[PDB]
Design a protein around this ligand. Structure first.
Ligand SMILES: [Cl-]
Ligand SMILES: [Cl-]
Ligand SMILES: [Cl-]
Length: 163
């Protein structure tokens, strides 16, 4: 575990993370995809061997010894708000199980279902709160990655609010 488990946020490419493992915002088919998924495919392509997994699940594949946790959030274009919300919460719970199982002291994590899978809605708070619900019981240092300057400020505020 981390000596004093923390949350932090950085605005940069998660492919350049300084953590012991990465969470991919994957698609169910293990395809290269777009956004975080395409960055992850360029950096750790070996981790896409048999990475296909259903919505609401996470599947870890090692790139060398570096674990890539493929977490499949729902595409809110296809899911109802209710069912999507359930699957988005479930994906993060499966991430927390994998992070625990791996024994890592740190994990780089994007906000699932906030990009192409957001169905055109701002889901920062929804996705971040499901991240916290899952990860709060873990003792890994969590570093959240984002690309937008206003998102960085809002995520940072949310982290600082809980102290
Ligand atoms: Cl960058
Ligand atoms: Cl997305
Ligand atoms: Cl972002």
């Amino acid at each position: 575990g981390a000596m004093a488990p923390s949350y932090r946020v950085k605005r940069m490419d998660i492919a350049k993370n300084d953590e012991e493992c990465v969470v991919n915002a994957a698609n169910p088919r293990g395809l290269p995809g777009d956004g975080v998924c395409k960055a992850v495919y360029k950096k750790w392509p070996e981790s896409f061997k048999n990475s296909a997994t259903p919505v609401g699940t996470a599947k870890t594949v090692m790139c060398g010894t570096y674990p890539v946790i493929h977490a499949v959030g729902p595409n809110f274009s296809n899911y109802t708000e209710s069912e999507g919300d359930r699957e988005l919460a479930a994906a993060y719970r499966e991430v927390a199980k994998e992070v625990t199982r791996l024994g890592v002291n740190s994990v780089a994590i994007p906000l699932l279902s906030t990009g192409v899978y957001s169905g055109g809605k701002d889901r920062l708070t929804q996705s971040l709160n499901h991240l916290f619900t899952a990860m709060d019981s873990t003792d890994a240092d969590v570093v959240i990655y984002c690309r937008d300057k206003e998102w960085e400020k809002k995520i940072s505020e949310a982290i600082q609010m809980r102290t």
